[PDB]
Amino acid sequence: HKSEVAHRFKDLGEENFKALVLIAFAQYLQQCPFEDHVKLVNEVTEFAKTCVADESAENCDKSLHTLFGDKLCTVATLRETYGEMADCCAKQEPERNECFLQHKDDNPNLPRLVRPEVDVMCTAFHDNEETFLKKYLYEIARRHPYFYAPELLFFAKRYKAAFTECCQAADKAACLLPKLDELRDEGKASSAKQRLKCASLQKFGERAFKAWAVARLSQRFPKAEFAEVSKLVTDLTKVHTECCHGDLLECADDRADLAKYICENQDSISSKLKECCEKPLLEKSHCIAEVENDEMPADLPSLAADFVESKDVCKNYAEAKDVFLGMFLYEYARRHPDYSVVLLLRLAKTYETTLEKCCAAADPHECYAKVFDEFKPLVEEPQNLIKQNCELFEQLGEYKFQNALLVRYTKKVPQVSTPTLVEVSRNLGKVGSKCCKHPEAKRMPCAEDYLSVVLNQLCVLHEKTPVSDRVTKCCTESLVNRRPCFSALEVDETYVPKEFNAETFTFHADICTLSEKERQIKKQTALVELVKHKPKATKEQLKAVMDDFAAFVEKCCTCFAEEGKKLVAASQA
C-alpha cells in the first residue's frame, strides 16, 4: 500500500470515509463547531481522491497517523482552545499520536443534548438530510471520544431508518420517539459497556478478561475445539487491550484481522457466521460480536469423566493450572449457553479453590468427588431470583414493579440520594420488561448484560459522591462478586429515620398537567422520602397511603392544599 489514504477510500467508500473522518476529528477537537469540522472533512476527502487518482502524488505516501496529526495542527485555534494538545505537535509522528490519545477528555463539560420537536426534526431531515445526519455523529463523538467509530456509524444508519419511516406517517411522534429512545439507550449502553471492560483490564488484569472471553466465545462457538477458542481468546484479548488505548486505526485493523481469521476458519468456528462474512469490511467485526449462538454438539458427555473421574486431573492441573481451568470453563460454557458468563466464572473459581487444597493433600479423588454438588447452590441462586422477580413483574406491571423495587432498595440502602434511588429502581424494572418475556434460555444471559450496565452506572454517581458504606463494598469487589453482594443487602436496622418535612410531600396541581413520565418521577420521589421518614411501615400500611394518594390526585383534579393536608396527618399512623 503505497498510499494508505487511497486504500481506505477504496475499501470504505466515499460516504463512510467522510463519516469516519468527521468522527475522528470530533473525538479529538471536541470543542470545535460543526462548521469547522465539515471544513476539515471535505479538505481530507478532496486530498484523498487525488491519491485515489495518482497513488504516487505528493504526501499520499505518508501514513494515516502522519497526515491526521498534520491536519490536526493545521487548526489555528489549537493552542488557545486545547492547550497542551498543541504543545505536543512539536513531537515526532510516533510520539505525537500517543500524546493526542492522552489529551482526550472522556467527560467534556458540554451542554446536555435536547431533543427538538418531532416536526422540527422531520423538517430538518427533509430540507438538508446531509447536515442533519452528520450532526448526529458530530455531537455523539465529541461527547464519547472512545466510542468505536464504525459502531457509531452503525447507529447513525438506524438513525435514518425511523426518520425515513416515521416522518411519513399520520402521527409522526407515534413511532419516531419510541425508536429514537430505544436507539438513545442502546447507544448509551454500548458506550458504558465499552468503558467498563477497559477498566476491567486495569485493576483486575488480563487473566480475568481471558476467562470471560473463554466462556463467552465457547457459548457463542460451541462446535469448536479448545485450541481454536484459546486462539480466539488470545487475539480478542489483544484487540480489547489496544482498543482501550484509544488508537482508533490500530483498533480498527486488529478487528479487521480477527474477522479475517474467523471468516477463513468458519468450519472450525461456527455455522451461524455464514451471512455476516459477506457483509462489507466495516460491518464484519461488528456483527460477529452480535452473532447468534450456534447449536451445541449433540452428544457432549458429562464433565465428570475428565474432571472428577480421573487420577491425572490432580496432575494435569499442576502442569498448567490456567490451561486446565480454561478447559473446564470451555466445556462447562459450551454445554450451558443459558448461564451467565459471571456464573460460569463463579463455578470455575470454586473448582479452582477446590483442587488447590483438595488435590494437594491425602486422598485427592476422595475429596473432589463431590465438587459438582457445590455447583448446585450457585447455579440455582440466580435461577430462583429470576423466577421470583419475573413472576412479580407479570402479576404487577412495569410501573408497579419499579415501585415495588423502589421501596425494597430504599429500605436496604436509605443513605443513597433520592434521585439516585429513583433512577436505579426504574432502570432495574425496565430489565424485567425486556427479558422476562424471554424463555429461561436467554433470560440469565440478558439479565447479566443489563444489570452490569445499571449497577455500574449506580456506582459512577456513588464514586463521585459517596454516601453508603455497604454500597461501596459491593462495587469495589470482583465482577463475579458485585451482583451477589447487592443481592445480599437487607434492611438497614442501623439507620436513623429522616425528619418529617411536609414541604416535600406537599404537592401542587401541576402534577395533573404534568406528563405521564414526569408524574411517575414525582410520585416515586415521594415514595422514597416516605420510606426514609418511617422505614418500619408495613406493606399493608404503605398500600393504604398509596391507594389514598391515587384518589387524592384524582379527586383534586388548587384542591391539593385543603384535602391534601388531610392525608399528611392521616398517613402519620
Ligand SMILES: Cc1nnc(SCC2=C(C(=O)O)N3C(=O)[C@@H](NC(=O)Cn4cnnn4)[C@H]3SC2)s1
Ligand atoms: C452514545 C449515545 N447514543 N445515543 C445517544 S443520544 C441519541 C441522539 C438522539 C436521541 O434520540 O436521544 N437524538 C435526537 O433526538 C436528536 N437530537 C437533535 O438535536 C437532532 N437535531 C434536530 N435538529 N438538528 N439536530 C439526536 S442527537 C443523538 S448518546
Ligand SMILES: CCCCCCCCCCCCCC(=O)O
Ligand atoms: C458480549 C460478548 C461480545 C464479545 C464476545 C464475542 C466476540 C465474537 C468475535 C467477534 C470479534 C469482534 C472484535 C471485538 O468484539 O472486539
Ligand SMILES: CCCCCCCCCCCCCC(=O)O
Ligand atoms: C430485576 C430485573 C429483572 C431480572 C431478574 C433478576 C435477575 C437476577 C439474577 C442475575 C443473573 C445474572 C447475574 C449473575 O449471574 O450474577
